[PDB]
A = this chain, B = another copy of it.
Amino acid sequence: SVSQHFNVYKATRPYIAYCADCGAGHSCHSPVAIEAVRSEATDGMLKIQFSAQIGIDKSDNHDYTKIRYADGHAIENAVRSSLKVATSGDCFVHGTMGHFILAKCPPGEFLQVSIQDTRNAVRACRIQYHHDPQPVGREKFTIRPHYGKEIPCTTYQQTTAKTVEEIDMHMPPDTPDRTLLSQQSGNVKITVGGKKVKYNCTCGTGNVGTTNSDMTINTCLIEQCHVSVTDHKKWQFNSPFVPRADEPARKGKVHIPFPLDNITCRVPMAREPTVIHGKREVTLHLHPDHPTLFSYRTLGEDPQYHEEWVTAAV
């Protein structure tokens, strides 16, 4: 079932990753950080991978109008009608599944993906990607014609079934935090907050370990202790921007959606050229509407081949 197709995603969770330039020429730790962009399709439908998943609510259940994202140590929720992808203008989101957005875009140099926070703020991550597609065939058109030819060309489907390719996922590491420490005269207090916390300290002896409650240690300073969240019962994508846990062993694999499929896609026929006869010569008047490739050769012993990209009438 479609809901049953999410059986895997019960074991995963969003993450926070580093956008070098995330809207205003500033580096930030965004929850919508871009990881990689794949453009193997001939049609030109980009597939984008980013930290936040789409299709899971915070209660880990199917919903097609809702996005779950990492925020602090928690998982917050946002609406899907607040998703924007853009290269230079405005882009069209053909499909979306979990960690992936399947979209189609006009030519440009940069790529930006943005969503809306629960506080009605805008979170955007934007990177550099030289996108300039050329359609299959021998003409660089821009819009399908209503009369032409069908040529085989490759695209990405919307099926969510099992696919051969896979993505590795591993165990999330400890997340440093400092907002879990307070001063009381001459002692330091740490609050559990509902999650297991690991502490290391240098005041006295035997002040290292792990806790699940509010602890107080006397004769210690704020700048003298470290606390970090440790539970991490869920899974996380292996990304080169988040440190790897102690265990160097892979924890699992997860299928990725939108495989590559062979379809038939449309091209227009060029206008016939004007032929003027002559003594062992021909004169061709060429009237192109788009950049079109023109080639010719002779059927003798040694041929005089030629080919060029005609753009204007010649």
The interface of chain A, by Cβ under 8 A from chain B, is: 18, 20-21, 25, 27, 109-110, 126-128, 141-146
Whether the Cβ atoms of A128 and B143 lie closer than 8 Å is: yes
Tell me the dominant secondary structure on chain A's binding face. loop
- Nearest B residue (CB) for A18: B146
Check A20–B145 contact: CB distance below 8 A.
yes
* A20 contact from B110, B126, B127, B146, Cβ within 8 A: B146
Complex Cα distance, B145 from A128, in Å, reads: 9
User: Assuming A110-B142, A126-B143, A128-B142, what are 15 further A-B pairs, CB within 8 angstroms?
Assistant: A18-B146, A20-B143, A20-B144, A20-B145, A20-B146, A21-B143, A21-B144, A25-B144, A27-B144, A27-B146, A109-B142, A110-B143, A127-B143, A128-B141, A128-B143
Instruction: List the B side residues contacting A27 at CB < 8 Å.
Output: 144, 146
- Residues on B with C-beta less than 8 A from A21 are 143-144
Nearest CB of B to A28, in Å = 12
Name the B residues within 8 Å of A146 (CB-CB). Answer: 18, 20, 27
Note all chain B residues with C-beta closer than 8 A to A142.
109-110, 128
Which B-chain residue is minimally distant from A147 (CB atoms)? B20
C-alpha gap A128/B142 in the complex (Å): 7
What are 18 sample pairs from A and B whose C-beta atoms fall under 8 A apart? A18-B146, A20-B143, A20-B144, A20-B145, A20-B146, A21-B143, A21-B144, A25-B144, A27-B144, A27-B146, A109-B142, A110-B142, A110-B143, A126-B143, A127-B143, A128-B141, A128-B142, A128-B143
CA distance A141 to B128 in the complex (A): 9
CA distance in complex: A141, B110 (Å): 10
Question: How far does the alpha carbon of A128 sit from the alpha carbon of B135 in the complex, in Å?
Answer: 15
For the complex of A and B, list the 3 residue pairs with the smallest distance between their C-beta atoms, beginning with the closest.
A20-B146, A128-B143, A21-B144
Query: Which residues in B have their C-beta under 8 angstroms from that of A110?
Result: 142-143
A127 to chain B, nearest CB (A): 6
Set of chain B residues within 8 Å of A109, measured between Cβ atoms: 142
CA distance A109 to B107 in the complex (A): 12
Question: B residues within 8 A CB of A143?
Answer: 20-21, 110, 126-128
Could you tell me the distance between the alpha carbons of A110 and B145 in the complex, rounded to whole angstroms? 12
Contact residues in B for A20 (Cβ distance below 8 Å): 143-146
- Chain B's closest residue to A109 (CB) is B142
Distance between A86 CB and nearest chain B CB, rounded to angstroms: 12
A110 CA / B109 CA spacing, docked (Å): 20
Residues of B within 8 Å of A141, CB to CB, are 128
CA distance A142 to B130 in the complex (A): 10
Q: How far is the CB of A142 from chain B (nearest CB, A)?
A: 5
B residues near A126, Cβ cutoff 8 Å: 143
Taking the closest CB of chain B, its distance from the CB of A48, in whole angstroms, is 15
Q: How far is the CB of A119 from chain B (nearest CB, A)?
A: 24
